[PDB]
Amino acid sequence: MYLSIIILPLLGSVVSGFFGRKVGVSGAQLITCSSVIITTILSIIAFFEVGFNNIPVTINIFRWIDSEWFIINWGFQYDSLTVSMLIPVLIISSLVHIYSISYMSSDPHNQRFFSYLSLFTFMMIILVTANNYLLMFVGWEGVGVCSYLLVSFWFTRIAANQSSISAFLTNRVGDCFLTVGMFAILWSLGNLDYATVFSLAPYINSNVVIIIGICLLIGAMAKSSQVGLHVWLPMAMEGPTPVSALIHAATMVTAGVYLLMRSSPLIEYSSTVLLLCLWLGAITTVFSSLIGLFQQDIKKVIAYSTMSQLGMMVLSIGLSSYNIALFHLVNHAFYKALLFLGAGSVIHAVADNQDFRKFGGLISYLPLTYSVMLIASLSLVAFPFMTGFYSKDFILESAYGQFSFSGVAVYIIATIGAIFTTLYSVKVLYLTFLSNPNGPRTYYRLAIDNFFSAQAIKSYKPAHEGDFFLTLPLVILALFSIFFGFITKDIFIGLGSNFFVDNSLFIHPIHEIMIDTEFAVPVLFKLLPFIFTISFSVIALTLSELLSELVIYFKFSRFGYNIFGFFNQRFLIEFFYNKYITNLILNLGGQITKILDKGSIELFGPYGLERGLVKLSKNISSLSTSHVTTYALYILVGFILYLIYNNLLLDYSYLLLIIILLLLLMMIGE
Amino acid sequence: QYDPPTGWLWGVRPGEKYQNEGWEGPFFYGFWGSLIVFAIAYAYKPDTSIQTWALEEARRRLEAEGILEDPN
Amino acid sequence: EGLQKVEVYERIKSLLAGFDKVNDPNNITETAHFANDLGLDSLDTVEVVMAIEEEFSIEIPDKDADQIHSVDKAIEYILRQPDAH
Amino acid sequence: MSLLYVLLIIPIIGIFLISTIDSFYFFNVSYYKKIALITTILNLIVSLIIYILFDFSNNQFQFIQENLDLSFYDIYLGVDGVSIYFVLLTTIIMPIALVSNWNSITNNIKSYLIIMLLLETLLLAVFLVLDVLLFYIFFESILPPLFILIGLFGSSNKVRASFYIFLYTLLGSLFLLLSILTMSSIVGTTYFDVLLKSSFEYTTQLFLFFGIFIAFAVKTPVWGLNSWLLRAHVESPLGGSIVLAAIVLKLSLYGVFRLILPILPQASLNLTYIVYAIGAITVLYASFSTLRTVDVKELIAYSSVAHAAIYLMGVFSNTIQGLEGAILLGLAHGFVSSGLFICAGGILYDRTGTRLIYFFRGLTQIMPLFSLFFFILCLGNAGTPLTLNFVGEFMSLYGTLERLPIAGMLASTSIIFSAAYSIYMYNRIAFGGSVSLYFIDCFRDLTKREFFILFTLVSFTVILGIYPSFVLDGLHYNISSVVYGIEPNASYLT
Amino acid sequence: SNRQAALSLYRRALKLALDWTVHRNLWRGQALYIRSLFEKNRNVTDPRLQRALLKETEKLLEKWKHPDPYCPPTAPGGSKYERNLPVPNLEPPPPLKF
Amino acid sequence: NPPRIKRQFRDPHADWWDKQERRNFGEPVHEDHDILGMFSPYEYTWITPGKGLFQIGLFIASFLGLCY
Amino acid sequence: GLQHYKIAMDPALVRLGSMISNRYKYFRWTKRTALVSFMYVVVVPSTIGYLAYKTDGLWDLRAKRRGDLISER
Amino acid sequence: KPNITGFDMREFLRHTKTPTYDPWERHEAWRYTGRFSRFNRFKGALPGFGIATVAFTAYCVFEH
Ligand SMILES: *P(=O)(O)OCC(C)(C)[C@H](O)C(=O)NCCC(=O)NCCSC(=O)CCCCCCCCCCCCC
Ligand SMILES: CCCCCCCCCCCCO[C@@H]1O[C@H](CO)[C@@H](O[C@H]2O[C@H](CO)[C@@H](O)[C@H](O)[C@H]2O)[C@H](O)[C@H]1O
Ligand SMILES: CCCCCCCCCCCCO[C@@H]1O[C@H](CO)[C@@H](O[C@H]2O[C@H](CO)[C@@H](O)[C@H](O)[C@H]2O)[C@H](O)[C@H]1O
Ligand SMILES: CCCCCCCCCCCCO[C@@H]1O[C@H](CO)[C@@H](O[C@H]2O[C@H](CO)[C@@H](O)[C@H](O)[C@H]2O)[C@H](O)[C@H]1O
Ligand SMILES: CCCCCCCCCCCCO[C@@H]1O[C@H](CO)[C@@H](O[C@H]2O[C@H](CO)[C@@H](O)[C@H](O)[C@H]2O)[C@H](O)[C@H]1O
């Protein structure tokens, strides 16, 4: 069974991709969807199997790489952390598959699309079920190849081809650092298996753990889209909406977080990386909360919301409460997938327009979508007793619960980042559903009012909700977004819970802050995020509905003109990357090609020896005039030079100077 | 309203058939045939790797210690 | 399948009908001229083509917008675009 | 006779039959091309027979013949795990190299087949010889057939391309000859068994190193000395390009396991920082200038320079892992570079007559089978996992880091830069917009010939990526013999 | 010249207004104000001053340019632009052998 | 050599032969054609590099001061 | 050789590709080309080589545990 | 000091209002009426609140 969870998504991908002609769009959709539905059911069972019974499962198939001290197997371990990740990965993958039957119905290439969906699920399973870091890297690269294949699904569009280059190469930068980090592990311990690395971790050189932890963290920025290497994640919104719901906001983005959570038995022995994890987390939350409030694309806002939540989990990891980060990771993939599938539904209704400035009303036209995205937005802001309430609000009070400067700092930073989250959540829900209509009448012209006479049969197209294959995922994910946090709060938060007591999430007694977070933190800071959400939400509603002039005053002031464009342009990080990193590399390639390879390497080489020697040989060849009188003089000359050399006992070097002088005199013309 | 499946595999139009250029005979029977016959033979190749030899000695040294249990 | 002449005409007729700068709603036909048949200024016609652009969610380049000086020329242009909603 | 001499006679017998068939019939060129192809398959069947019998943990050379008669120059053939996979690679490529270029030659077809059948013997010999002067004899006997292969069946800039390869390879290899002659003078023979026993004085080693490395640096090739390859590979016919990249570029890689690792160890150790400095530079510069190359076939050739540098730093690691990774990356390069050359030189050039990346766009829309294989060969060039190219790079890069960490850290940047050019080339030909407008008429997709050699080459790259132990179990014991070093408690046992 | 140029600037300044002011009611009042400023200069004749008022308008269109101007979805710069662009040559390949 | 101008600053609505690339069939090409086309790194024209460093400094100064 | 399909060969791109191919025939030694050539061929390799020599055998990570130092030398 | 163009940004913002007379007034009047009046837009901004409030009071009265 366990090895069958791994195998099923792979087989459905192969049928849809290499045999799409035989099965057709219907047969590809059925085999692809059914295989991942079956895998999802087998994985829910494996959660009861492994986690609730504390029975880890080991299976090794054959060796991959065999050398001295290097034995890396095609082996898989199922523990409490593995089955925890598999549930959001396979529930969301199953639902996005069912969703994609309705969303991609009109597209010409459905077999290729559904094949890439199953290929992504297979690779994500490989990433969380591996025995060792090198097989986890296969899923890491595999998910990257699948994200490139899905961002660039519409290859005809150049924008898509630029954005897929960004995703591929910004993730290769993280891969370089993981490869260095895995080299460090092999160099120190001789093998990179999890049992080996974690059993020996308490004793390794403390500075060796620094090198591995930094390399593991740098690799984690690229995939988890942390501020240093995050430019790719918003560009991955070029691919179709269901791709952005699973890969770009509910599964692959979390792999960086999984890498740190898996490596907890190692990075816990280096508090130096834990400060970097923590500050890395707090920066990305305010960095991306500010940007999303000034975006005009709905997908761009929901992409910048995901990076604000990924920054929350990395903050929790550096806070040294891994069960909290795992709890947020699973809870977030339910409501972030909901908002993306809900946004995808309004894009479908409004003729593929993705701009808030052209959406209005629509609340009466898309009632289910509005309520469902209201479900998602209340857990995104962690409204009390929602699924996101138990995960996001425990990260905040755990930051203040570690009574340190860095903890109180990140609490202030993260709380401000939460304020801007509430602002762009109102923006999305107000401008798409609650504001006056800002788009053409075609989305709002019904048949109850007669605008036509001889064309009443057709041509109204008034923004209707989709079909069963579209709404069904949205309803299910809504139920998760309301109740999943409560029903699983003990498995993850607990107080002395033993769910991860198979060393899947190792907390060192020195770093435990759980008891203080339960008792030490004052009620004011415990309740503080709630008042801010309720107060800002009403303030932004009035400034968007009642008092709409004031924001016009801000953006028409030169101060606010610069502040609006600064955050709209994403801190100008894209600007400085193309101009000083990307273009710098393309100039360097040109200078090597133009001035060195085709320049001085051929001048101080074959071409300069060619043109130099041909000139020399013509001059010496011009000494031969076929005159016996002049040839006789040469013999006497060459006779005397031999007599001088072997009678004046001259230094042999004096001769070589003569030859080099003579040769270079024939090198000069005229 | 899905369309019929289409295309010309190998560029052979729906009228005619694939014309054998000449390479096909040796390449399918000799080149690939040799690899399947090599694959089936490789299964019965005796294992003369250093590790199968070094594992068995290594087990007999660790069996002389509490690290590995001996069947005797 | 695509856009029809009667569908585009009904929408532009209602567009110009709701514009106070037309001399009369009655004399707006398929072959109506903006400058003299409808009596519109050189800036009112620029506003008109912007309203037509909003109605069909398309873009009118400066080269093409200068050509639109009558209803029929506008009707033809919208149907010459396979991108209008 | 031995079984290693049967490897050499069969390609010679095929040369004879192509030359004499016209004397029994005006014969078709299709009959000449079946003889050459059946001859290369038989060499591949013998080589698979040799591999079945081969002992994976034996320190004696195998399948040797008792000469018992000594002359001034005598051919001595033997096989060790270090050389068996180089022989197999030569015998899998040569059949595909012929099939790939089956229609593209058209004129002088007998001459073309005779040169390849002659090249197969000379490249097979260079791995089978058990002397270092005999190694040099065949490592340089390939230069006259390759001068005439490029000149007779090459592209427009063929004359200069063929002069570059011959003169650079002749010049570089004449510094190797001086070093070999010195070792023979001091020891009295170049037979490996007698030379490997002998230990040279450090100063002799440091000057023998200067002369074997100068040869290898030209033939790797390193960055400031790679001009011949940028000309040779591009202007060469498709078949010549496949041989030169997959098999000839590996002669220097296999020559370090014979001429440097076992007989000049102190020199290799004290000079590795010079090797690594060069290897690091040729990783960066080659990769920066592969990004701005506008000829597709010359973009595949430049990619080879960056990969050879990873395997060169791997052979100089004094580590078991980097040495086996170097051989794996050379085997991996043999399959992937062959496929990318087939795509650029044998599918695009066949249909367009152009190699300029300006003219290609959206080729996936009309040629979906080409784009699938082209993507897989681009990913392997990028060292993606599940391909043998990833295993070789990882082991080559780890031994580089364990030897001198800083240089392996720069060399690890190949993970970002090989990816950069591979995807950028891919997105500009297969993707990048709709089918170009420079294509007046539609292009057909892959032929059953083009498909099945691309599929065969991809199949070797992926299967060997999954289970590299097919090649790793043979090299372990024999690689163990080229490591220099001791451990304080494992050595000098009593 | 000097007419379609001033009409291009009139349409442009009305798009920049709707881009910054997202609400159409509010932009409606802004739109009447920019007309008044074009209609205030309908009797300028000499090219020395005619082209100065276009040059200085072009400065105010850059001075207040939007970081992300609205683009219709199927327009160049739009979300669905070039999404399933058809092959520009549907004719079967000419009969050549490779 | 023509001016080294990125073709993203050309008119997308001109009667281009190749509309996707914004090019005509005979027009001269800069020697840097590779990295001047529509499939090349983007050019952001929001503000000047010098003014951008200022505004990046003001963000940092504000965030360091909050830490202070 | 074999007839290829018809390509609308752009005279502008054909002469550009010809320019890139014959470009070396026009390289000169200027104050600028020497400065770029000296930087790339001498300075960067000499800097990389110098660090390679100074840090050679400086560190080893194998089996090093707490209480041991990474530095060999 | 004033520009040659009559544009003043202070006066521009003063006119950022709903104009008293508008030539396009009737063309845009559909966006503020009917389904798009103030009440109608926010009539169902909280979908299940009304049904849930009365239902929760029924559960809340459990003393009797
Ligand atoms: P009809 O043919 O009757 O008239 C059309 C025009 C006006 C073109 C006539 O042909 C004409 O008289 N031409 C002369 C053009 C001229 O010199 N002056 C006319 C006005 S040009 C102009 O720009 C006027 C000033 C406008 C200032 C506001 C626009 C910019 C605002 C900033 C951006 C938007 C806010 C953020
Ligand atoms: C994975 C690829 C990279 C691996 C190779 C790079 C490893 C880098 C290791 C750096 C640390 C090496 O070992 C480190 O050396 C520094 C000096 O430089 C010394 O550091 C020492 O500094 C002070 C003196 O100034 C000592 O009092 C203190 O006890 C210690 O911190 C120690 O000897 C050791 O902490
Ligand atoms: C380490 C430094 C270098 C090591 C040694 C490498 C030296 C290589 C030098 C080769 C010089 C080129 O060699 C010379 O090239 C020219 C092309 O320009 C050839 O010239 C030929 O090609 C031209 C191209 O237009 C044609 O007109 C015609 O086919 C012929 O004249 C010469 O036949 C050849 O002798
Ligand atoms: C990484 C670099 C590796 C280099 C390996 C060794 C390469 C060969 C070394 C010598 C190369 C020949 O070097 C070249 O010689 C000839 C001498 O006539 C000169 O060639 C040129 O001289 C001057 C330019 O200065 C010209 O006006 C003249 O037309 C031409 O003959 C070049 O100045 C020199 O660059
Ligand atoms: C050390 C020297 C370098 C060695 C390098 C290897 C060179 C190998 C060359 C192959 C032998 C020569 O190859 C020889 O080519 C000539 C071309 O005129 C052929 O001769 C024939 O060719 C075609 C065949 O239809 C006829 O049109 C032509 O009239 C006739 O001469 C021979 O049948 C072939 O055997």
Side-chain angles (χ1 to χ4, degrees), chain A residues 254-305:
Chain A
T254 83
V257 176
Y258 167 78
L259 183 80
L260 307 162
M261 267 186 312
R262 164 66 55 191
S263 309
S264 63
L266 170 70
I267 68 184
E268 208 62 7
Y269 290 98
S270 164
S271 78
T272 300
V273 300
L274 293 165
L275 294 174
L276 300 183
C277 302
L278 173 77
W279 285 94
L280 183 63
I283 301 299
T284 309
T285 295
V286 286
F287 177 89
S288 65
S289 296
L290 280 167
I291 297 174
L293 175 63
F294 287 90
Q295 302 292 117
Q296 316 290 313
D297 198 74
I298 190 154
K299 292 192 67 182
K300 280 283 184 54
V301 174
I302 309 190
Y304 270 109
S305 186

Side-chain angles (χ1 to χ4, degrees), chain A residues 11-13 15-17 19-35 101 110-111 114-115 118, chain B residues 2:
Chain A
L11 310 179
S13 179
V15 180
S16 185
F19 292 105
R21 289 191 64 86
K22 287 77 170 61
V23 287
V25 176
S26 299
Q29 280 169 350
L30 172 80
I31 286 169
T32 288
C33 287
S34 54
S35 66
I101 294 180
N110 290 138
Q111 294 96 299
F114 273 77
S115 182
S118 287
Chain B
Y2 298 122

Side-chain angles (χ1 to χ4, degrees), chain E residues 17-47 49-66:
Chain E
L18 193 48
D19 276 351
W20 284 110
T21 313
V22 168
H23 306 111
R24 301 182 53 88
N25 38 4
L26 277 296
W27 157 81
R28 199 72 268 177
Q30 300 180 184
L32 280 48
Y33 169 93
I34 303 287
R35 186 182 168 95
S36 302
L37 296 186
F38 273 82
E39 184 74 33
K40 192 179 279 187
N41 300 338
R42 299 235 293 194
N43 294 323
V44 178
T45 53
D46 44 352
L49 295 156
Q50 188 170 179
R51 71 168 47 94
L53 263 298
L54 256 55
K55 196 170 173 296
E56 200 68 20
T57 293
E58 192 76 27
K59 316 198 73 53
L60 282 172
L61 261 287
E62 295 294 332
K63 184 178 184 293
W64 292 99
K65 71 201 176 81
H66 206 283

Side-chain angles (χ1 to χ4, degrees), chain A residues 605-606 609-610, chain D residues 159-160 163-164 167-168 171 225, chain G residues 24:
Chain A
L609 275 167
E610 183 178 1
Chain D
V159 176
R160 210 173 166 91
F163 270 82
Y164 271 55
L167 293 170
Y168 250 103
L171 191 140
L225 287 180
Chain G
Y24 69 100

Side-chain angles (χ1 to χ4, degrees), chain A residues 246-425:
Chain A
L246 179 59
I247 306 94
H248 306 108
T251 47
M252 168 189 186
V253 289
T254 83
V257 176
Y258 167 78
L259 183 80
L260 307 162
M261 267 186 312
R262 164 66 55 191
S263 309
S264 63
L266 170 70
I267 68 184
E268 208 62 7
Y269 290 98
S270 164
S271 78
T272 300
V273 300
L274 293 165
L275 294 174
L276 300 183
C277 302
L278 173 77
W279 285 94
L280 183 63
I283 301 299
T284 309
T285 295
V286 286
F287 177 89
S288 65
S289 296
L290 280 167
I291 297 174
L293 175 63
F294 287 90
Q295 302 292 117
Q296 316 290 313
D297 198 74
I298 190 154
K299 292 192 67 182
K300 280 283 184 54
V301 174
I302 309 190
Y304 270 109
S305 186
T306 305
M307 176 188 304
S308 187
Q309 307 287 297
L310 290 169
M312 281 287 91
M313 320 165 180
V314 176
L315 191 147
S316 165
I317 283 164
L319 193 59
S320 174
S321 52
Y322 300 99
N323 52 325
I324 317 300
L326 180 56
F327 194 38
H328 199 247
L329 185 146
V330 56
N331 291 13
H332 174 257
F334 291 130
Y335 51 78
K336 189 46 66 192
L338 196 52
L339 267 159
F340 253 126
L341 292 191
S345 70
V346 310
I347 308 166
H348 202 110
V350 298
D352 268 347
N353 183 68
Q354 290 181 353
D355 205 322
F356 295 113
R357 300 175 275 185
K358 302 294 160 169
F359 303 151
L362 290 180
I363 179 157
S364 73
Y365 294 79
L366 304 166
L368 191 37
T369 297
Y370 164 69
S371 80
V372 167
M373 293 177 71
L374 188 53
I375 302 294
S377 307
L378 284 177
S379 47
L380 173 52
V381 300
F383 200 89
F385 313 119
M386 287 315 264
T387 292
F389 174 63
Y390 299 89
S391 42
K392 195 156 87 165
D393 266 331
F394 204 84
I395 302 182
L396 277 296
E397 65 183 1
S398 301
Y400 196 92
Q402 182 179 2
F403 284 76
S404 78
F405 164 69
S406 296
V408 160
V410 293
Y411 177 85
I412 290 298
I413 303 163
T415 312
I416 297 169
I419 280 170
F420 290 93
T421 293
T422 297
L423 297 179
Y424 67 68
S425 279

